[PDB]
């Protein structure tokens, strides 16, 4: 993708994450765990559902057209009827091919972008209390029991509570 998160600095996906598209994995004193992030998952699903809705929107209702099969050669007018229908088919096939290629490029970029926006949200919450380890993970420089982990997941983590502990451990002062 354009953002280099999926298939990038996050090295693989998680087969265990079954109730979300994006999520958190943690290890603290009390153990490990994983939960889904609902906001990122829903925004990516809504954008993809939007493109689906844009396509399965059938407005192409035709009744009396032209003949399209001929048992024998007839000359000028049959040549024109065949040529018109071949021209139409070639243009519609080009449109289908290009639409799918563009949409897929964009869908891959959108999902990579949503991965990246989640990473940046957590970064901005942690402020000076954590460091980016380089693989989608943050090293947190204060103890963080299960309630503190959930506070990070649910967006109520207050960095100021932990800042001086974390800064002292980060830099040894």
């Amino acid at each position: 993708g354009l953002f280099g998160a999926i298939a990038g600095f996050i090295e693989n996906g998680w087969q265990g994450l079954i109730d979300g598209w994006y999520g958190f994995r943690h290890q603290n004193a009390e153990g490990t765990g994983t939960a889904a992030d609902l906001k990122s998952t829903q925004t990516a699903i809504d954008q993809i559902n939007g493109k689906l809705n844009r396509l399965i929107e059938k407005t192409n209702e035709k009744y009396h057209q032209i003949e399209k099969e001929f048992e024998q050669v007839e000359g000028r007018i049959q040549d024109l009827e065949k040529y018109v229908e071949d021209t139409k088919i070639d243009l519609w096939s080009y449109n289908a091919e290009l639409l799918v290629a563009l949409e897929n490029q964009h869908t891959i970029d959108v999902t990579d972008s949503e991965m990246n926006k989640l990473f940046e949200r957590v970064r901005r919450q942690l402020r000076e209390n954590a460091e980016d380890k380089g693989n989608g993970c943050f090293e947190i420089f204060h103890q963080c029991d299960n309630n503190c982990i959930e506070s990070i997941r649910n967006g109520t983590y207050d960095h100021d509570i932990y800042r001086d502990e974390a800064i002292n451990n980060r830099f040894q002062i």
Partner: protein, 320 residues
Amino acid sequence: YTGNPVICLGHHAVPNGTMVKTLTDDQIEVVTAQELVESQHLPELCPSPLRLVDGQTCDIVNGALGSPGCDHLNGAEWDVFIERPTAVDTCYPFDVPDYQSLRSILANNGKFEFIAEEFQWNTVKQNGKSGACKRANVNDFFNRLNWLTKSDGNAYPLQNLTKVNNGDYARLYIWGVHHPSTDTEQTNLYKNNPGRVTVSTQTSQTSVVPNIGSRPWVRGLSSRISFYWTIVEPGDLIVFNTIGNLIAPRGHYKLNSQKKSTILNTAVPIGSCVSKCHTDRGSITTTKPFQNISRISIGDCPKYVKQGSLKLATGMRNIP
């Protein structure tokens, strides 16, 4: 673990995904995809919501002329006339100059509503019948046509008859010209040897001279009929003028003012399912926007495309 807590952000994956195409990659793996090209069809045509009329053994043209196997089409109305490739001619051997135009007008108009009119032909014999056109097991003729011949007294006087369209709708008259196989058949049937048929309205006139000669034998005969048509708008009128060889109409078909019907030529049976999209290969029920089943599609249909497959990605890259 060192004892500093870690939080990792990530994304899901599945053991095996689906490959899709993009602008930069011919095949790249994603978690979910959706196929956009319908390839499967029902082996039947569905009779709802569109009104389908099955011609069975009658062509639409033979159905308009009223040939023997076609009485079930009297009064019919359709969105799609289903024409069978096993249809055969059952009556007088005929041709239609600009055949496809008559077929298209009939199919597009969408109904066989015939209004009988009495034509007061004078002296000539009427209701001629033929061995080439058996009904029950007896010589007969097209239902909608009246084959005029000379009287027992060997007269075929000039015929000159008018019908005025003082009604609400455009009228379709189908008429014919008999082409005998010899000169003596010409005089035997019509007295006058160059016959002559002229059919005109205010603004148009089609005029026809018969062609005499031996054609291949079909159902007993080497003579032929050529059929023509004339549309009469409200306020206009039609004149039939002949000194022989006219195969006269018995009335006219009503034309709908909005023409939205069509014809489909296929051997596929009519079943009992529901679908608003038909092909010559059968109906299709799909929400996909494209299809590779047939060029020939009628109704609320996906667009026919060349590709057998186009996968829309509906998820992220799959990296298990």
